[PDB]
Amino acid sequence: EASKGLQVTASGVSVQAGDGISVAGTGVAVKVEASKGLQVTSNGVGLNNTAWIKMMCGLHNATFYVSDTYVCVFFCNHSTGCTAYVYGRGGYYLSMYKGDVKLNSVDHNEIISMVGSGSIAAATMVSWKSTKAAAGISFKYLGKNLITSTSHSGSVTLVAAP
Amino acid sequence: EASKGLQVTASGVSVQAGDGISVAGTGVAVKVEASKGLQVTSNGVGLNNTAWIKMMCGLHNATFYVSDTYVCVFFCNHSTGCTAYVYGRGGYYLSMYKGDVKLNSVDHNEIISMVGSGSIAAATMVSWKSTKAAAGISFKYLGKNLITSTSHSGSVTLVAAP
Amino acid sequence: KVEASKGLQVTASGVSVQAGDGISVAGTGVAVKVEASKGLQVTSNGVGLNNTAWIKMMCGLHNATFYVSDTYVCVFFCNHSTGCTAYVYGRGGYYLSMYKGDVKLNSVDHNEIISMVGIAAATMVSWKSTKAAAGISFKYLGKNLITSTSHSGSVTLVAAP
Ligand SMILES: [N+]
């Protein structure tokens, strides 16, 4: 007869799926939970290409984020507003100029930066004294780079942490 | 005949558990290794909520760390002492002032920071010339933020990297 | 003789477990199959992250297509415009020096650096007209805050995982 891991029903003998496992006519497979950073293909189980977002939200204890080709931002609500930790992507960094980082269309307050040559400075922590991060709120920013004078003007919306 | 994936005892045919798999009367499940960043629920396999710690320890090749609601820090022992890489959490950052970062009650020797307006500065690397990181000793710090002038005097105990 | 259903298959060798995505089936039993290049491992203790998964995470963070890593520094390179810009993290207590001749890609000196302030530690480094590619050289000087050690290193670029 059948015992551990197998079961008998009207359909005959089958493999009984437990936690992390799917059983179908396509075989016994690993089941990955959506939004927890893994994928599974015919090559096997692995990290997906956005697992790093969950990691950075954990790092900063952020509850909302944005990510596009040129910047990502991890927002923490505290006191009367929000402070976010910024990482450049694709070669870009985030401008620290007065009008260049808006949350819910509100201009930022204090920024902490890293420093380049001349007047170059890259925003790494950005705060809004009286504006909160929330899902669906707009984030409008200007990114810059060190090769050309091109400014990247992006408008995206906040997403809840995974 | 029962063949690959199955095993036979006097009690019948069962699924044989290989690496990463557990088999019980309740079925075939994924087995995750405790300290390696994954979890398994009825919803499937995923990263757990502290996998980011392993990632950051790997990033800096750190052997000890701390994490609380205000800050996390990753320590590398080298020469006669140690150097730590600092990340703010929850919107906070670490004061870089002379008496504001202690390891085992010893004041730091050197700090590298990111810079804000006026005297605002956030510690990003902190070094002690002759104090070693080890599990069970205290890290004391002053957390601050960009919205209010409130400070948090914190104390958190070092833990071995996972 | 047999009435087999989901998860099982029957061949001339008998009834066996049918392997789907993420599963391997052998005489040693049913095991998890990890995609070895995507940061996971499987041992007798179970499935977990391997010790280079952090590199995949950091390439994702910066959308980098090449990197270097040694025990003193890691760098994540993004090709854009006519050149390359890289994001820099210290390792082992070290940091990347920001002097003019201290950071070369394919033997070419950088054009711009962004840094943290101490002493200064480079966090972003850029080359106007040099591209990142696998196998080319990254030559740098690493420093630390305890001693005056000058680590002159040369390391080779690796394709992002
Ligand atoms: N990470």
mmCIF file of all heavy atoms in Angstrom, chain C residues 70-104, unseen atoms left out:
data_model
loop_
_atom_site.group_PDB
_atom_site.id
_atom_site.type_symbol
_atom_site.label_atom_id
_atom_site.label_comp_id
_atom_site.label_asym_id
_atom_site.label_seq_id
_atom_site.Cartn_x
_atom_site.Cartn_y
_atom_site.Cartn_z
ATOM 1 N N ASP C 70 36.444 41.848 -4.477
ATOM 2 C CA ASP C 70 37.551 41.209 -3.772
ATOM 3 C C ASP C 70 37.334 41.456 -2.279
ATOM 4 O O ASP C 70 36.277 41.937 -1.859
ATOM 5 C CB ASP C 70 38.915 41.606 -4.363
ATOM 6 C CG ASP C 70 39.272 43.060 -4.127
ATOM 7 O OD1 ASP C 70 38.653 43.712 -3.262
ATOM 8 O OD2 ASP C 70 40.194 43.561 -4.825
ATOM 9 N N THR C 71 38.322 41.120 -1.455
ATOM 10 C CA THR C 71 38.118 41.290 -0.019
ATOM 11 C C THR C 71 38.234 42.740 0.455
ATOM 12 O O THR C 71 38.076 42.989 1.656
ATOM 13 C CB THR C 71 39.059 40.385 0.790
ATOM 14 O OG1 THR C 71 40.415 40.638 0.424
ATOM 15 C CG2 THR C 71 38.738 38.912 0.543
ATOM 16 N N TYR C 72 38.499 43.690 -0.446
ATOM 17 C CA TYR C 72 38.644 45.101 -0.102
ATOM 18 C C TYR C 72 37.557 45.989 -0.688
ATOM 19 O O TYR C 72 37.300 47.064 -0.143
ATOM 20 C CB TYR C 72 40.006 45.625 -0.587
ATOM 21 C CG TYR C 72 41.173 44.815 -0.081
ATOM 22 C CD1 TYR C 72 41.577 43.664 -0.751
ATOM 23 C CD2 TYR C 72 41.864 45.196 1.065
ATOM 24 C CE1 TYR C 72 42.635 42.901 -0.286
ATOM 25 C CE2 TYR C 72 42.943 44.446 1.530
ATOM 26 C CZ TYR C 72 43.313 43.308 0.852
ATOM 27 O OH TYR C 72 44.373 42.561 1.314
ATOM 28 N N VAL C 73 36.923 45.596 -1.793
ATOM 29 C CA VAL C 73 35.982 46.483 -2.469
ATOM 30 C C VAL C 73 35.086 45.647 -3.364
ATOM 31 O O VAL C 73 35.458 44.558 -3.798
ATOM 32 C CB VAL C 73 36.739 47.540 -3.309
ATOM 33 C CG1 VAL C 73 37.376 46.891 -4.550
ATOM 34 C CG2 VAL C 73 35.822 48.697 -3.669
ATOM 35 N N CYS C 74 33.897 46.168 -3.655
ATOM 36 C CA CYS C 74 33.098 45.687 -4.773
ATOM 37 C C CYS C 74 32.519 46.881 -5.519
ATOM 38 O O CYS C 74 32.283 47.950 -4.943
ATOM 39 C CB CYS C 74 32.003 44.689 -4.363
ATOM 40 S SG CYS C 74 30.843 45.285 -3.129
ATOM 41 N N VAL C 75 32.321 46.700 -6.820
ATOM 42 C CA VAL C 75 31.954 47.799 -7.705
ATOM 43 C C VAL C 75 30.950 47.265 -8.711
ATOM 44 O O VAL C 75 31.144 46.184 -9.267
ATOM 45 C CB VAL C 75 33.202 48.370 -8.416
ATOM 46 C CG1 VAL C 75 32.844 49.566 -9.256
ATOM 47 C CG2 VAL C 75 34.305 48.744 -7.420
ATOM 48 N N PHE C 76 29.891 48.034 -8.969
ATOM 49 C CA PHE C 76 28.793 47.619 -9.841
ATOM 50 C C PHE C 76 28.681 48.602 -10.989
ATOM 51 O O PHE C 76 28.378 49.778 -10.764
ATOM 52 C CB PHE C 76 27.508 47.507 -9.023
ATOM 53 C CG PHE C 76 27.675 46.541 -7.904
ATOM 54 C CD1 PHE C 76 28.057 46.969 -6.645
ATOM 55 C CD2 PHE C 76 27.581 45.185 -8.152
ATOM 56 C CE1 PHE C 76 28.298 46.047 -5.637
ATOM 57 C CE2 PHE C 76 27.823 44.262 -7.151
ATOM 58 C CZ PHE C 76 28.170 44.687 -5.903
ATOM 59 N N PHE C 77 28.927 48.112 -12.210
ATOM 60 C CA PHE C 77 29.130 48.958 -13.382
ATOM 61 C C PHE C 77 27.874 49.036 -14.241
ATOM 62 O O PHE C 77 27.246 48.013 -14.553
ATOM 63 C CB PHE C 77 30.254 48.400 -14.260
ATOM 64 C CG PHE C 77 31.602 48.360 -13.602
ATOM 65 C CD1 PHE C 77 31.974 47.285 -12.807
ATOM 66 C CD2 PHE C 77 32.514 49.391 -13.804
ATOM 67 C CE1 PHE C 77 33.236 47.245 -12.202
ATOM 68 C CE2 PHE C 77 33.759 49.358 -13.196
ATOM 69 C CZ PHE C 77 34.125 48.279 -12.401
ATOM 70 N N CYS C 78 27.553 50.256 -14.674
ATOM 71 C CA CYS C 78 26.449 50.520 -15.589
ATOM 72 C C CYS C 78 26.992 51.233 -16.818
ATOM 73 O O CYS C 78 27.579 52.315 -16.707
ATOM 74 C CB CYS C 78 25.401 51.410 -14.927
ATOM 75 S SG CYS C 78 24.685 50.731 -13.424
ATOM 76 N N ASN C 79 26.769 50.646 -17.989
ATOM 77 C CA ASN C 79 27.132 51.296 -19.240
ATOM 78 C C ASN C 79 26.017 52.246 -19.663
ATOM 79 O O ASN C 79 24.841 51.882 -19.647
ATOM 80 C CB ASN C 79 27.333 50.229 -20.313
ATOM 81 C CG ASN C 79 28.641 49.497 -20.154
ATOM 82 O OD1 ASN C 79 29.642 50.078 -19.756
ATOM 83 N ND2 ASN C 79 28.646 48.220 -20.498
ATOM 84 N N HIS C 80 26.391 53.469 -20.018
ATOM 85 C CA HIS C 80 25.418 54.461 -20.456
ATOM 86 C C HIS C 80 26.160 55.529 -21.236
ATOM 87 O O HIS C 80 27.370 55.713 -21.078
ATOM 88 C CB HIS C 80 24.635 55.062 -19.279
ATOM 89 C CG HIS C 80 25.468 55.891 -18.354
ATOM 90 N ND1 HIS C 80 25.433 57.270 -18.345
ATOM 91 C CD2 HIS C 80 26.374 55.533 -17.411
ATOM 92 C CE1 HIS C 80 26.260 57.723 -17.419
ATOM 93 N NE2 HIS C 80 26.855 56.689 -16.847
ATOM 94 N N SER C 81 25.420 56.224 -22.102
ATOM 95 C CA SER C 81 26.023 57.232 -22.970
ATOM 96 C C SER C 81 27.245 56.602 -23.640
ATOM 97 O O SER C 81 27.172 55.444 -24.075
ATOM 98 C CB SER C 81 26.287 58.486 -22.149
ATOM 99 O OG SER C 81 26.889 59.492 -22.943
ATOM 100 N N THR C 82 28.387 57.277 -23.673
ATOM 101 C CA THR C 82 29.584 56.793 -24.343
ATOM 102 C C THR C 82 30.507 56.010 -23.416
ATOM 103 O O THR C 82 31.577 55.572 -23.852
ATOM 104 C CB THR C 82 30.368 57.976 -24.920
ATOM 105 O OG1 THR C 82 30.502 58.995 -23.921
ATOM 106 C CG2 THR C 82 29.640 58.549 -26.131
ATOM 107 N N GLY C 83 30.140 55.833 -22.150
ATOM 108 C CA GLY C 83 31.053 55.274 -21.160
ATOM 109 C C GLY C 83 30.356 54.442 -20.125
ATOM 110 O O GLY C 83 29.438 53.668 -20.435
ATOM 111 N N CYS C 84 30.771 54.618 -18.873
ATOM 112 C CA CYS C 84 30.389 53.729 -17.792
ATOM 113 C C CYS C 84 30.415 54.525 -16.495
ATOM 114 O O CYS C 84 31.286 55.377 -16.306
ATOM 115 C CB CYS C 84 31.426 52.594 -17.745
ATOM 116 S SG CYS C 84 31.273 51.404 -16.447
ATOM 117 N N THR C 85 29.466 54.239 -15.603
ATOM 118 C CA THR C 85 29.499 54.749 -14.236
ATOM 119 C C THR C 85 29.246 53.589 -13.286
ATOM 120 O O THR C 85 28.409 52.720 -13.566
ATOM 121 C CB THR C 85 28.463 55.858 -13.992
ATOM 122 O OG1 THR C 85 28.744 56.961 -14.863
ATOM 123 C CG2 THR C 85 28.549 56.355 -12.530
ATOM 124 N N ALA C 86 29.984 53.564 -12.178
ATOM 125 C CA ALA C 86 29.949 52.452 -11.247
ATOM 126 C C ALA C 86 29.668 52.938 -9.830
ATOM 127 O O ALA C 86 30.046 54.048 -9.444
ATOM 128 C CB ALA C 86 31.278 51.727 -11.266
ATOM 129 N N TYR C 87 29.001 52.074 -9.066
ATOM 130 C CA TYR C 87 28.675 52.294 -7.662
ATOM 131 C C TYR C 87 29.596 51.420 -6.825
ATOM 132 O O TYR C 87 29.767 50.237 -7.135
ATOM 133 C CB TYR C 87 27.209 51.921 -7.404
ATOM 134 C CG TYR C 87 26.238 52.676 -8.297
ATOM 135 C CD1 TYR C 87 25.916 52.208 -9.564
ATOM 136 C CD2 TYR C 87 25.669 53.879 -7.879
ATOM 137 C CE1 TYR C 87 25.037 52.909 -10.390
ATOM 138 C CE2 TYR C 87 24.788 54.582 -8.699
ATOM 139 C CZ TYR C 87 24.485 54.095 -9.950
ATOM 140 O OH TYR C 87 23.611 54.787 -10.774
ATOM 141 N N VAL C 88 30.180 52.003 -5.777
ATOM 142 C CA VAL C 88 31.308 51.421 -5.049
ATOM 143 C C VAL C 88 30.918 51.167 -3.593
ATOM 144 O O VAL C 88 30.337 52.039 -2.934
ATOM 145 C CB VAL C 88 32.538 52.348 -5.115
ATOM 146 C CG1 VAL C 88 33.706 51.763 -4.335
ATOM 147 C CG2 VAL C 88 32.937 52.609 -6.566
ATOM 148 N N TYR C 89 31.264 49.979 -3.088
ATOM 149 C CA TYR C 89 31.099 49.625 -1.680
ATOM 150 C C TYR C 89 32.402 49.055 -1.138
ATOM 151 O O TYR C 89 33.013 48.193 -1.767
ATOM 152 C CB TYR C 89 29.978 48.600 -1.499
ATOM 153 C CG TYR C 89 28.650 49.153 -1.919
ATOM 154 C CD1 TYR C 89 28.277 49.169 -3.254
ATOM 155 C CD2 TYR C 89 27.770 49.674 -0.980
ATOM 156 C CE1 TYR C 89 27.071 49.705 -3.651
ATOM 157 C CE2 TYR C 89 26.548 50.205 -1.371
ATOM 158 C CZ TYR C 89 26.209 50.214 -2.705
ATOM 159 O OH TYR C 89 24.983 50.744 -3.083
ATOM 160 N N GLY C 90 32.820 49.529 0.035
ATOM 161 C CA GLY C 90 33.991 48.967 0.678
ATOM 162 C C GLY C 90 33.704 47.613 1.304
ATOM 163 O O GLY C 90 32.576 47.304 1.686
ATOM 164 N N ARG C 91 34.752 46.792 1.416
ATOM 165 C CA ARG C 91 34.670 45.504 2.093
ATOM 166 C C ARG C 91 35.830 45.345 3.064
ATOM 167 O O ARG C 91 36.909 45.912 2.871
ATOM 168 C CB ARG C 91 34.665 44.325 1.097
ATOM 169 C CG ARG C 91 33.572 44.456 0.021
ATOM 170 C CD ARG C 91 33.493 43.195 -0.828
ATOM 171 N NE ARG C 91 32.707 42.132 -0.198
ATOM 172 C CZ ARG C 91 33.073 40.858 -0.183
ATOM 173 N NH1 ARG C 91 34.230 40.496 -0.726
ATOM 174 N NH2 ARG C 91 32.297 39.950 0.396
ATOM 175 N N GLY C 92 35.582 44.585 4.128
ATOM 176 C CA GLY C 92 36.647 44.243 5.053
ATOM 177 C C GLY C 92 37.189 45.397 5.861
ATOM 178 O O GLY C 92 38.283 45.286 6.417
ATOM 179 N N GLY C 93 36.463 46.513 5.925
ATOM 180 C CA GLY C 93 36.937 47.717 6.576
ATOM 181 C C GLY C 93 37.579 48.716 5.639
ATOM 182 O O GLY C 93 37.885 49.835 6.064
ATOM 183 N N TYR C 94 37.815 48.337 4.389
ATOM 184 C CA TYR C 94 38.471 49.227 3.449
ATOM 185 C C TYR C 94 37.463 50.088 2.707
ATOM 186 O O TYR C 94 36.247 49.877 2.764
ATOM 187 C CB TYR C 94 39.355 48.428 2.478
ATOM 188 C CG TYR C 94 40.681 48.057 3.105
ATOM 189 C CD1 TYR C 94 40.741 47.162 4.163
ATOM 190 C CD2 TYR C 94 41.869 48.638 2.669
ATOM 191 C CE1 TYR C 94 41.952 46.835 4.765
ATOM 192 C CE2 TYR C 94 43.089 48.312 3.268
ATOM 193 C CZ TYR C 94 43.116 47.416 4.315
ATOM 194 O OH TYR C 94 44.316 47.083 4.934
ATOM 195 N N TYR C 95 37.997 51.099 2.029
ATOM 196 C CA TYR C 95 37.226 51.983 1.180
ATOM 197 C C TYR C 95 38.086 52.283 -0.041
ATOM 198 O O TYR C 95 39.294 52.048 -0.037
ATOM 199 C CB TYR C 95 36.801 53.260 1.939
ATOM 200 C CG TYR C 95 37.937 54.176 2.339
ATOM 201 C CD1 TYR C 95 38.431 55.125 1.455
ATOM 202 C CD2 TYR C 95 38.504 54.100 3.597
ATOM 203 C CE1 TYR C 95 39.468 55.963 1.806
ATOM 204 C CE2 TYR C 95 39.543 54.940 3.965
ATOM 205 C CZ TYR C 95 40.025 55.865 3.059
ATOM 206 O OH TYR C 95 41.062 56.707 3.413
ATOM 207 N N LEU C 96 37.451 52.805 -1.081
ATOM 208 C CA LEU C 96 38.125 53.108 -2.339
ATOM 209 C C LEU C 96 38.645 54.537 -2.299
ATOM 210 O O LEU C 96 37.876 55.480 -2.077
ATOM 211 C CB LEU C 96 37.143 52.936 -3.497
ATOM 212 C CG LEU C 96 37.699 53.230 -4.892
ATOM 213 C CD1 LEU C 96 38.869 52.334 -5.168
ATOM 214 C CD2 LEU C 96 36.630 53.068 -5.972
ATOM 215 N N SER C 97 39.945 54.690 -2.519
ATOM 216 C CA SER C 97 40.555 56.006 -2.585
ATOM 217 C C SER C 97 40.018 56.774 -3.779
ATOM 218 O O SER C 97 39.674 56.207 -4.818
ATOM 219 C CB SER C 97 42.065 55.860 -2.755
ATOM 220 O OG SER C 97 42.672 57.128 -2.944
ATOM 221 N N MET C 98 39.971 58.087 -3.626
ATOM 222 C CA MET C 98 39.399 58.976 -4.622
ATOM 223 C C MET C 98 40.432 59.847 -5.326
ATOM 224 O O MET C 98 40.050 60.805 -6.002
ATOM 225 C CB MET C 98 38.300 59.807 -3.957
ATOM 226 C CG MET C 98 38.835 60.659 -2.792
ATOM 227 S SD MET C 98 39.697 62.192 -3.148
ATOM 228 C CE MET C 98 38.349 63.223 -3.718
ATOM 229 N N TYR C 99 41.725 59.546 -5.200
ATOM 230 C CA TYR C 99 42.729 60.352 -5.886
ATOM 231 C C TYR C 99 42.581 60.220 -7.403
ATOM 232 O O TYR C 99 41.946 59.292 -7.921
ATOM 233 C CB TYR C 99 44.141 59.973 -5.438
ATOM 234 N N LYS C 100 43.182 61.175 -8.119
ATOM 235 C CA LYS C 100 42.973 61.277 -9.561
ATOM 236 C C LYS C 100 43.478 60.043 -10.299
ATOM 237 O O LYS C 100 42.823 59.568 -11.234
ATOM 238 C CB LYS C 100 43.637 62.541 -10.107
ATOM 239 N N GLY C 101 44.636 59.520 -9.914
ATOM 240 C CA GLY C 101 45.177 58.364 -10.596
ATOM 241 C C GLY C 101 44.896 57.031 -9.941
ATOM 242 O O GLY C 101 45.549 56.039 -10.283
ATOM 243 N N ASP C 102 43.932 56.963 -9.028
ATOM 244 C CA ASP C 102 43.744 55.780 -8.203
ATOM 245 C C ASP C 102 42.629 54.845 -8.665
ATOM 246 O O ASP C 102 42.372 53.855 -7.971
ATOM 247 C CB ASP C 102 43.504 56.167 -6.734
ATOM 248 C CG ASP C 102 44.785 56.541 -6.003
ATOM 249 O OD1 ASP C 102 45.883 56.311 -6.550
ATOM 250 O OD2 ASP C 102 44.691 57.036 -4.861
ATOM 251 N N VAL C 103 41.931 55.123 -9.771
ATOM 252 C CA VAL C 103 40.820 54.254 -10.188
ATOM 253 C C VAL C 103 40.812 54.157 -11.715
ATOM 254 O O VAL C 103 40.369 55.089 -12.394
ATOM 255 C CB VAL C 103 39.447 54.738 -9.685
ATOM 256 C CG1 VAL C 103 38.403 53.673 -9.955
ATOM 257 C CG2 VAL C 103 39.464 55.142 -8.202
ATOM 258 N N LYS C 104 41.249 53.016 -12.257
ATOM 259 C CA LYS C 104 41.353 52.825 -13.701
ATOM 260 C C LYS C 104 40.468 51.679 -14.170
ATOM 261 O O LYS C 104 40.322 50.673 -13.477
ATOM 262 C CB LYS C 104 42.789 52.502 -14.125
ATOM 263 C CG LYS C 104 43.816 53.568 -13.780
ATOM 264 C CD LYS C 104 45.227 53.071 -14.127
ATOM 265 C CE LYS C 104 46.172 54.204 -14.474
ATOM 266 N NZ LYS C 104 46.240 55.190 -13.376
#
